[PDB]
From a paper:
Out of the IL-18 SCAs evaluated, DR3097 exhibited the largest VHH–VHH interface with a BSA of 1402 Å2. The VHHs are positioned side-to-side against each other and engage in a large interaction network comprising hydrogen bonds and various hydrophobic residues in the center of the interface. To enforce the dimerized conformation across the VHH–VHH interface, seven pairs of cysteine mutations (S1 to S7) were designed using the Rosetta protein design program to determine structurally compatible disulfide bond positions in the DR3097 SCA. LCMS analysis showed that all stapled SCAs except for S2 formed a disulfide bond with no detectable traces of the reduced form, suggesting that the dimeric conformation could be sampled in solution and might not be just a feature of crystal packing. We observed an increase in melting temperature (Tm) for all six SCAs that formed a disulfide bond over DR3097 and the S2 non-disulfide-bonded SCA. The highest thermostability improvement over DR3097 (Tm = 61 °C) was a 16 °C shift measured for S4 (Tm = 77 °C), followed by 13 °C, 12 °C, 7 °C, 6 °C, and 3 °C shifts measured for S6, S7, S1, S5, and S3, respectively. Surface plasmon resonance (SPR) experiments showed that IL-18Rα affinity was retained for all variants, while affinity for IL-18Rβ was lost in S1, S6, and S7. The engineered disulfides of S6 and S7 involve residues that are directly located within the anti-IL-18Rβ VHH CDRs (S160 and T179) and appear to be important for receptor engagement. Yet, in the case of the IL-18 SCA DR3097, the dimeric interaction has enough temporal stability in solution to ensure stoichiometric formation of the engineered disulfide bonds, as we have shown for the six DR3097 engineered disulfide pairs. While others have shown that conformation stapling can lead to increased agonism in canonical antibodies, here we are not able to achieve an increase in activity beyond conferring an increase in thermostability of up to 16 °C. This is likely driven by a reduction in affinity to IL-18Rβ, due to the corresponding VHH CDR being proximal to the dimer interface.
Numbering used by the authors: 1 to 51, 55 to 101, 107 to 118, 130 to 227, 231 to 242
């Protein structure tokens, strides 16, 4: 088989920009010039970029831009002027000629510290919670990152100043998120963990700031 890996998932405020990345490896020649795809929970799979000359949907035309690098097996997507319809898990390409883990991207519609962590089997019913300077109106766009030592940042869940929730395909159905309106903290369920999930977890992403980071392991 051929392997695809997406990376670059961010939670951003509207009008912001991103670069998605997709690194490939497989059994055939070093360059295959092909595209990008996405999915939001209220939507099916959708083409984002690709093909013999490049193509973009009307919904992203002029905003998203594909590019490629040949020395390092990476294909990219500049994404300018992000919008709350662009909150989606972005996927790279058909496996051969009809498949990656999926990278969550979220766009928000409107002294850091975390708690929880530990060691688990066979997984579920945890109380990770993120908690800093709770009282004074600090309630901002938020989500939980995770990182294992080799591979890069992966966004798994998101919340914001409103109770609206979205997840990564890596965790969909298994993770779950909520926020307390009096304690002003956000919680992560972490149901039915799998060894692939062992990572240190972080709570924040962008400027007005990093988390403490807390390790979850599941060894059994």
């Amino acid at each position: 088989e051929v392997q695809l890996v997406e990376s670059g998932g961010g939670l951003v405020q509207a009008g912001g920009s991103l670069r998605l990345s997709c690194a490939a490896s497989g059994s055939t020649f070093s360059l295959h010039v092909i595209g990008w795809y996405r999915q939001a929970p209220g939507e099916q799979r959708e083409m984002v970029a690709g093909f013999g000359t490049p193509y973009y949907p009307r919904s992203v035309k002029g905003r998203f831009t594909i590019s490629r690098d040949n020395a390092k097996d990476t294909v990219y997507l500049q994404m300018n002027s992000l919008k709350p319809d662009d909150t989606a898990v972005y996927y790279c390409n058909a496996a051969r000629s009809d498949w990656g883990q999926g990278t969550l991207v979220t766009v928000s519609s409107g002294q850091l510290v975390e708690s929880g962590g530990g060691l688990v089997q066979p997984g579920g019913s945890l109380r990770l919670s993120c908690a800093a300077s709770t009282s004074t109106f600090r309630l901002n766009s938020i989500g939980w990152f995770r990182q294992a030592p080799g591979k890069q940042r992966e966004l798994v869940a998101t919340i914001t100043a409103d109770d609206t929730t979205a997840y990564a395909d890596s965790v969909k159905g298994r993770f779950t998120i909520s926020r307390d309106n009096a304690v002003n903290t956000v919680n992560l369920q972490m149901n039915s963990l799998k060894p692939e999930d062992t990572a240190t977890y972080y709570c924040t992403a962008r400027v007005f700031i990093r988390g403490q980071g807390t390790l979850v392991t599941v060894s059994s």
